[model samples]
Target: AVATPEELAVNNDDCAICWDSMQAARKLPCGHLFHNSCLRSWLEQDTSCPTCRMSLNI
Candidate 1:
């Protein structure tokens, strides 16, 4: 499965990868979101959401 794009909230949102503010948001089908930049780094080595076990298969 592939993740989709979602709106970035004004309230600071933290990314699963860096555990910091997300410069950009990438929303996963599992309802999880991450930094647009950090997301790729994890997906490069894994196809699952960084925090959840949901398989993104991307």
Candidate 2:
């Protein structure tokens, strides 16, 4: 829920987790993007963006 469709579509790019293409990407309210796999894993323990450490509600 941290990502909007607009954010996902507009800033579509690589993921911060492995620094690879985010064909499976999700975006942040902070305007950051990353792989959905990574986000789910990370969010399991924390609620922050990997790059910015901005808190995510997910």
Candidate 3:
């Protein structure tokens, strides 16, 4: 699911790539939260989770 800045709360609101609090977030099937921009950037190289090797549909 895609989440807006306001949707993100204190809990589970961090991106593993940029290592920052997520304003625009995408929740992976693996239950990982990443900044949409950050994750999209990473997806350019590989469509897998940075923390886990799960394949992403996006």
Candidate 4:
């Protein structure tokens, strides 16, 4: 399901990354946030972040 603007704005205090909203972002399982489309592009190139090797699609 796609997240609505209102849903996107609903911050989960426990998820620090999502506490600050992003315009085109998705909430990762690790409680981190990243641009939806942008991250899709990144994942296409690399499955994990440069810093953390955590699986992007847990």
lDDT of 3 by residue, 4-44 (tens): 45466355666688896846777777777777778778778
User: What would you estimate as the lDDT of candidate 2?
Assistant: 0.64
Evaluate candidate 1 by giving its C-alpha RMSD to the native, one decimal.
3.7
Task: Give the alpha carbon lDDT tens digit for every residue of 18-39 in model 4.
Answer: 2344556555565555666555
Clashes of each: 0, 0, 0, 0
On residues 1-58, what C-alpha lDDT tens digit does candidate 1 reach at each position?
2244344533547656778674577666677776666767777777886567778654
Q: What is the lDDT of residue 28 in candidate 1?
A: 68
lDDT of 2 by residue, 19-42 (tens): 666456666667666566776787
User: Which structure among the candidates has the greatest TM-score?
Assistant: 3
Among the numbered candidates, top lDDT falls to 3
- Weakest 10 consecutive residues, lDDT, candidate 3? 1-10
Model 2 bad stretches (over 4 Å): 1-13
Error of 2 at 29 (Å): 1.3
Residue 2 in model 2: lDDT: 42
- Give the runs in model 3 whose Cα sits over 4 Å from its true position: 1-5, 9-11
Clashing pairs in 1: none
| lDDT for model 1 | 0.64
> Model 4 compared with the native: what TM-score?
0.50
